[PDB]
């Protein structure tokens, strides 16, 4: 099984990339369930730029063909306690995302699940032994509410609802 992303317009197969990282936002407020929720970043290109793990691919919430960590998944932030500061997530092993060309780009469900687990594990190092939950974007302008990227002189918009819907103890 794979995770498919509704894209618009339809990205050509040669626009398939390797996810080398992503950027998140920790949800504010409090919960009596001892859980920490993370969503796609509600920040700007500024948040993305300060991550400094991108290559030559202009993308929003997922880093395409960027820098990979040499040991383990590394997470960074200007301030872990400030929920207005995004969290930069650099992967150790890239995950293939293949575009069929008919409007969908598919990602391996197993590899992405394992990836989220490595992210959640590292997140537990910073926020303690709590339940890590990934939820879809809180919203925003088309470029940022979707996983958007440039390829071959064209800008595509891919919904990432199915990428961020997991719970990890």
């Amino acid at each position, epitope marked *: 099984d794979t995770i498919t992303l509704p894209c618009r317009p339809a990205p050509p197969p040669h626009c398939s990339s390797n996810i080398t990282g992503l950027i998140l936002t920790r949800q*504010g*407020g*409090y919960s009596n369930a001892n859980t920490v929720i993370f969503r796609p970043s*509600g920040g*700007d290109w500024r948040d993305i730029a300060r991550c400094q793990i991108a290559g030559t691919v202009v993308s929003t919430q997922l880093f395409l063909n960027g820098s990979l960590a040499e040991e383990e998944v590394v997470i960074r932030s200007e301030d872990w306690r400030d*929920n207005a500061k995004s969290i930069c997530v650099q992967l150790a092993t890239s995950v293939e995302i293949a575009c069929t060309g008919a409007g969908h780009c598919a990602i391996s469900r197993a590899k992405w699940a394992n990836t989220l687990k490595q992210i959640a594990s590292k997140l537990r190092e910073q926020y303690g032994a709590k339940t890590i939950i990934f939820k879809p974007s809180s919203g925003g*302008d088309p*470029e*940022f509410v979707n996983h958007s990227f440039n390829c071959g002189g064209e800008f595509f918009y891919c919904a990432s609802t199915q990428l961020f819907a997991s719970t990890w103890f």
Partner: antibody, heavy 118, light 107 residues
């Protein structure tokens, strides 16, 4: 001078929705996050969420996740706050505040009174 | 998180008064809270930010300090216009305001 001006007081029925606007002046609207804080009559201040004026991105408190929607109109430098499925305990004065950092809210709007009653 | 403030406090003109704000979470020494002044029927206003820093236009009478798990707002030259509600605010994790301390100036 830096100034935030909010819309007028409103009376509402439970189950309905309300949309408050916050007009910014004296500074570049996109330069700062906009936060929303409400205050029940005779009670304290309660944080609701912030919005990124450049990306439209938001982050609501889990207490209001699914009931609040925060938007903006950069053309008229206005931030909007909409709360749906209102209840009696949503009766409060709603403030908008310029982030200016972490918890360094300045300045605040004059506030908008939303009375929810059957 | 949760911040605890005294419900009210009293002071006579000219004297100094201190309002305390104690956190029940994991308390780090590493400039925690801000302070807000709110007159009745008015919006809150920033008096002290990042523990002790004071923004432009705010009188020197308002000073900020901290000891252990308790942050404190101290007003030196107490005047009648100081009569308002004072809230402490922390951003750690998620923005949380204190219960508020209703200061009364006994004139």
């Amino acid at each position: 001078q830096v100034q935030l001006v909010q819309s007028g007081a409103e009376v509402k029925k439970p189950g309905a929705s309300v949309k408050v606007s916050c007009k910014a002046s004296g500074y570049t609207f996109t330069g700062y996050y906009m936060h929303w804080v409400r205050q029940a009559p005779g009670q304290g201040l309660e944080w609701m969420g912030w919005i990124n004026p450049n990306s439209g991105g938001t982050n609501y408190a889990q207490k209001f996740q699914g009931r609040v929607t925060m938007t903006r109109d950069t053309s008229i430098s206005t931030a909007y706050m909409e709360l749906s499925r209102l209840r009696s305990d949503d009766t409060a004065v709603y403030y908008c505040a310029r982030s200016l950092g972490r918890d360094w809210f300045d300045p605040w709007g004059q506030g908008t009174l939303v009375t929810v009653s059957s | 998180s949760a911040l605890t403030q005294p419900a009210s406090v009293s002071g006579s003109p000219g004297q100094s008064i201190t309002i305390s704000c104690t956190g029940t979470s994991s308390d780090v020494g590493s400039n925690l809270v801000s302070w807000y002044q709110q007159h009745p029927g008015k919006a809150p206003k920033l008096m002290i930010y990042e523990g002790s820093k004071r923004p432009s236009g705010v009188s020197n009478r308002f000073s900020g300090s901290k000891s252990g798990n308790t942050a404190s707002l101290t007003i030196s030259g107490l005047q009648a216009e100081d009569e308002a509600d004072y809230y402490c605010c922390s951003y750690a994790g998620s923005v949380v305001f204190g219960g508020g301390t209703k200061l009364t100036v006994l004139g």
